[PDB]
Ligand SMILES: [Co+2]
């Protein structure tokens with residue numbers, strides 16, 4: 001019955017000086033206001049996002065984990081630090097620095113704080129090395145964006161990197177980023193409410209419908225962020241469109257809704273009816289408690305939705321604890 | 332207990348000659364293969380989509396409605412014919428021609444076939460006239476795309492056109508079209524499975540979060556196509572993000588999940604767990620049987636999902652019959 005939060009974010013103590021070493025416009029860095037209890041993520045010289053002390057001060061973060069019942073948390077890089085847009089070596093150097101930063105982070109109570117490494121996904125080689133280097137170095141797995149410009153998970157680049165980690169028993173977190181839309185969704189944080197779930201839901205079908213779960217070893221432990229996005233809902237549509245149009249069946253040989261046993265999703269759906277539906281489509285043994293701590297939109301009572309539910313008692317424990325522990329190899 | 336299908340599509344007997352009158356590249360037209368039992372929608376000279384005889388031959392369509400139990404169907408223009416991209420008068424002339432075509436269509440058994448008019452939404456004036464002209468001419472309401480280039484339903488143009496129809500008791504169907512994504516979702520009909528639900532779900536929040544349901548008279552009967560898209564699922568997230576970020580609350584003064592009494596959705600979700608969830612968020616009196624007949628992805632047993640459900644007996648009738656009849660004023 002320890003409680004494991006497995007989606008969560010961090011950001012390292014990088015000065016504006018160090019970030020200009022890599023790119024004075026597109027590297028990010030952390031800027032603390034005098035007090036040391038607020039601050040903002042900065043893109044070169046612009047204000048990207050306000051954040052608060054939980055995102056860099058792990059000592060503070062353990063106090064908070066105590067006040068929510070979180071025994072073990074898993075953190076990992078904030079989407080922004082991914083820089084998949086960059087030159088392929090500077091990025092592989094950037095990523096080795098972060099996973100190094102992140103490792104000192106969990107080095108504050110590594111029995112409680114577990115990290116997940118980012119990669120330089122543009123070059124397929126660098127990333128395969130970076131991921132096995134940083135999983136031996138300490139991490140429990142890798143966190144990647146769900147798409148690479150116009151390359152979704154179907155692209156053989158990303159299939160390859162997956163099939164590498166399936167073999168090395170390197171668990172994988174896929175996290176939406178670099179949202180679609182272009183111009184239209186500018187106001188009200190729409191990009192987080194419509195684009196983001198849609199991006200994850202796209203990433204999943206980009207495997208099932210490309211038939212990648214037929215070529216990728218069944219060892220692959222892969223989880224998708226924000227409850228799979230609008231998936232467990234839109235599934236019924238995908239099955240229907242596969243029963244009825246040839247060119248949907250083209251490379252997917254079973255009915256899509258059969259591959260719900262090849263991946264996992266977290267619980268971050270924020271609604272007890274949503275969660276029920278989500279579990280029935282995924283199976284009580286494939287949904288894992290995540291919170292998206294500390295960002296503003298991630299349930300401040302971590303676990304609350306899961307325990308304020310109708311769910312069974314075995315189920316509740318599997319999400320909270322079981323599933324995540326089997327997933328990451330936590331004792 | 333008559334059964335009313337209220338989402339459905341048609342396309343008129345337009346020759347390639349007539350379509351060049353308006354645009355030899357972007358007007359569409361219907362081309363029948365010799366037999367008169369198959370054919371294809373054509374953009375000038377390209378093959379847009381294959382279709383089958385149900386989409387133009389209403390005599391045939393009544394035979395089919397007999398073999399599904401459909402007593403009254405409501406059809407309306409196929410997204411493609413919208414031409415919101417066009418010069419503003421040619422479009423208002425195009426639209427008056429279609430709603431005229433469509434009227435002869437339902438003029439085959441108008442006690443069974445009911446139509447819904449399209450508009451030239453780019454010019455706000457033309458459309459307000461076109462819509463009251465064609466609702467007196469015979470139609471039961473208007474069907475519009477959910478967005479206008481980069482203008483979503485929040486844009487005051489489209490708020491205005493809504494507030495006009497709320498007053499004239501002109502019911503409204505919002506149908507996704509002109510999907511987002513740009514380049515990435517090219518293969519496997521992804522655009523129908525990820526973009527399309529996302530577009531409808533965006534259109535709905537573009538009202539709630541803009542606060543438009545506060546300025547728009549409560550008379551407004553408006554329905555959203557394809558079960559609201561990934562809405563009833565992602566709602567829990569929207570509420571959460573409104574409880575927690577100021578700039579989401581900026582123009583929305585109640586918690587978003589309260590406006591589920593200002594619109595309706597059809598049933599086209601294709602999964603009994605999806606439908607259950609959809610009804611609980613919308614209320615048995617706000618979900619209406621639709622089928623997306625005849626396009627390939629619209630359940631060939633019309634009503635099957637609704638009656639193959641756990642739902643109550645009053646509920647089942649309200650979706651099938653009740654709600655739609657109150658919605659369109661059908662006796
Ligand atoms: Co996150």
Ligand SMILES: [Co+2]
Pocket residue numbers: 338340506556623
């Ligand atoms: Co449709």
